[PDB]
Design a binder for these strands. Sequence first.
DNA 1: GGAGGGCAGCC
DNA 2: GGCTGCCCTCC
Length: 737
Amino acid sequence: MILDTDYITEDGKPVIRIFKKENGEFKIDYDRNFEPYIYALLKDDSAIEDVKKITAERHGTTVRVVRAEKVKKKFLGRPIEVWKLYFTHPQDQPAIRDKIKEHPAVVDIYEYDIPFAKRYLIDKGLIPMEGDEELKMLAFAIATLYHEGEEFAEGPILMISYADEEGARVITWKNIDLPYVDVVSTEKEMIKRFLKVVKEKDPDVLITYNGDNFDFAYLKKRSEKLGVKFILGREGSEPKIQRMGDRFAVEVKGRIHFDLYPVIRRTINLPTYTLEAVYEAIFGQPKEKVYAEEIAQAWETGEGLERVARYSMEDAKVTYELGKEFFPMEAQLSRLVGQSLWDVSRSSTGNLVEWFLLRKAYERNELAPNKPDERELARRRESYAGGYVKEPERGLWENIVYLDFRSLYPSIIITHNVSPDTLNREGCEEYDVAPQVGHKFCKDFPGFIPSLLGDLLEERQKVKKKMKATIDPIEKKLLDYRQRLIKILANSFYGYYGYAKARWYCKECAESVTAWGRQYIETTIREIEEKFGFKVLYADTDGFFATIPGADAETVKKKAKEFLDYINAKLPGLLELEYEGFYKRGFFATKKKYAVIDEEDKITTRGLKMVRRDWSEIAKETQARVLEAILKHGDVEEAVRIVKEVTEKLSKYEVPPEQLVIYQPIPGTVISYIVPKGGDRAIPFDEFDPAKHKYDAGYYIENQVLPAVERILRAFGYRKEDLRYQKTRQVGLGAWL
DNA sequence: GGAGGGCAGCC
DNA sequence: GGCTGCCCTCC
């Protein structure tokens, strides 16, 4: 199985190294015959003799063009004859490409910025992470001595922990009577001991949590300070540090440095990305955090070191567990895109699509367009119109169905052949015209991107069907990941079209997809209203909520199924409307803000409860009470009385202070405070005394309860003044009113 | 009074 | 370092 590729230079010549793992043994294959190249479009074939003599200089030695050969490729569907220019070394390309481009007879140059090792995988048709080879993995973590105003790695590494199938162990230079702790004499000996473990275990994968920007950098500075050659690589090399924009990334030659931090950052959405929060969300099990202060205090006092060593052990243990959970998915992503797991795990959506397209382009003899220059990039900053959002019909509705399109944007791209190579093509026999924007797309030949997108959707169906027949639960999980990743990649094509740095960028394509989307959703709405008598309550981008005001629950379901059969017979190509769900009740307050409930009493809220900007228990409790009264009881006037009851109790100081605590996640803990009657007046709840102090009733009414509930009750016509404690009316003659 | 945070839609 | 639409808050 192919792990990764790179190149070394031997006597000025590039040598590709292919790192492989076959039959449980590590192998390095060498290729000294891969020639780097660039394409050049000339306005005259006679000019090739002038461009062959173009020279540049790379570190004293003269850079020259080895040889040139005329090649026929496709560029934007149309055939193109371009000159394939060969070079001795890949580093010759950045040195000479500008001199070649500036030549008068050169119209343009192409594929001049593609990394040599990645160009090799594509050109040779090699796919990394292919096969059933089982990789040996090892996770590791470090604990350090931290002091507030000191430089990076000024304090020593206190402990180094590691974990695999054999379990988790901790290496330290202090006596700890724990079964999993290995004691050495010094920090220098601890680092040397860690190196021996990695060498003896010889793992194919090194798993870290933020090892790209902390662990490796800390180990490097300490090994330099102590005089230890940090040889982690399979060929005796030290970890190589690279720049990824504003941050860093670390390679370990011969192995795969799998940093879980950038992976989990993309895959899962969490409020915080501490190792503790991540583990608790993925495995549902708690993990205690031991802060830098506690670690430093324990090491200096020499007391409480059991707790520190256990935290160190758990760090390696959970990092191995998480690595075991995310690596197989990243392995399938690597195999799908066709690039190393190291790169795919650190790449964003735009880069993943681009690498996929670059490989496909080579397979189809398609000349790839260049990345945009600074001038062209500034031309691509202009935006376009997106999805359709209907202003909701206010009020409480009963028996609601949600209908939506299955893969609307990929379906549009395939159905209408939306692509830069089909856009306004001359001599069209058949074309589809995008509404509003008016862009014409030829249908005579399959467009490059729609063709690939169709193959992806077809391949996904072939893997969904293979899942049903696979008994092996490990293989079924692997197929599940491949299937999921194909859907993710397919849904990235639309965004890629409007991505200014994309090689295959096409604003006309991007806005045509959204224009067609707006047409299909609006056409479907007027169709269900005029021909089936439905009321469309709300709609957002590719779906809508509809109902028949005075109809039975079974009647609305029947009519919805009949409508689905009707419009699906009219829809072109891959476009298809789906049932999605039925809801007993629902209210649509404003665009992006609504709430519905199914027949099982499950409530779904969007744009309302989601607002987690410092909310007291009293505001959360009454919002839930309001939501329940409206959706489960269907009683809007009861929800009003609840708010009036709560504001009256708050104004008369009858609400206990425990229900007034506000939680704010900020050194890195949740602060619990209360607002008093005396705007920077807030105090921690621990110091609040009901016998000595009074809370701000006005604040909890006007800034807590009312804002949270008004956003819901505004849909029914209630203002903020319709919910406060209006107080008893002045009855009798004594009042004189 | 703008700018922009943070959300919904991308089952 | 995939797209836009929109309600609401801070400045």
